[PDB]
Amino acid sequence: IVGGYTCAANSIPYQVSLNSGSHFCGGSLINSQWVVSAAHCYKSRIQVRLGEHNIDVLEGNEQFINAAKIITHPNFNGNTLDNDIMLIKLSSPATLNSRVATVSLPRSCAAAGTECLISGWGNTKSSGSSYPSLLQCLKAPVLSDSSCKSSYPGQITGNMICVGFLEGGKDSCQGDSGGPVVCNGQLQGIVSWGYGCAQKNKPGVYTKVCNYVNWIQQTIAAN
Ligand SMILES: [Ca+2]
Ligand SMILES: [Mg+2]
C-alpha cells in the first residue's frame, strides 16, 4: 500500500497473508473454511496466515493453516485480467474470534463515491521497494465509471471497478494482490491490477466481487 497508514493491530480481522516461504499475496476470510483472493496470485502450494499484524514476528494471535484446495475462476483470463478471483479451502477451519473473523460478501454492488478500506503487506514505496512488517491500510473511494474507464481505455470489463485517487500517491501495489477492498462492511473488491501503483490517472483496478457471490457460494457448497 502506497500512501497509506499502519492499521491498528488485528483491526482487519478478515485479512490473511498467503505465504509460500514468504508473504506473496493477500486474501480475505469469507467462511471459516474459505479464503478469497486473486487468480493471478495462484501457486500450487499455499500456507494461509490468519490473525497477523507483524508478518515477521510471531505475536500470539496467528493461525497458520495450509490450503487444501485452490480453485481459480474457470474464466480467468491472464491477459485482460477478467475474472481475477480464486478460492482457497483451508485444511482445517479457522477458529473465529475477535482477531480472526469473516467479512460479508456484497449484498449489492457499491455506489460510486462509497468509502472503502484497502489493506495489505505489499510494497509501500512509490519509487523502489519497501515491504512492511506491519499491515498497511488505505481509505479510498469507489471511482466514477467515467474516471475508471477513461483511465484504461477499452480495458475495464463489467467485472472490474476502480477504487482510489486520480491524483496519484495512494494505491495498492505488488504484494497487496488478492487482498480486500471492504466498503460498508462488505467485500466489494479484490486487489487485481493497474499500471504500476500510485501513478497519476492510473487508479487501482479491482475484481468486482458483487458479480461473484453465486460462483463463490456454489464453489463452497460443492467442495
Ligand atoms: Ca506475526
Ligand atoms: Mg520484509
Swiss-Prot record:
Catalytic activity: Preferential cleavage: Arg-|-Xaa, Lys-|-Xaa
Main location: secreted
Entry-linked InterPro entries: Peptidase_S1_PA, Peptidase_S1_PA_chymotrypsin, Peptidase_S1A, Serine_Proteases_S1, Trypsin_dom, TRYPSIN_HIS, TRYPSIN_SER
Residues binding Ca(2+), per UniProt: E52, N54, V57, E62
Domain Peptidase S1: 1-221
Active site: H40, D84, S177
Domain of life from the UniProt record: Eukaryota
Example of a GO cellular component annotation carried by this entry: extracellular space
EC number: 3.4.21.4
Required for specificity, annotated site positions: D171
Disulfide bridges in this chain: C7-C137, C25-C41, C109-C210, C116-C183, C148-C162, C173-C197
PANTHER family, alphabetized: RIKEN CDNA 2210010C04 GENE, TRYPSIN-RELATED
Name of the protein described by the UniProt record: Trypsin
Source species of the chain: Sus scrofa
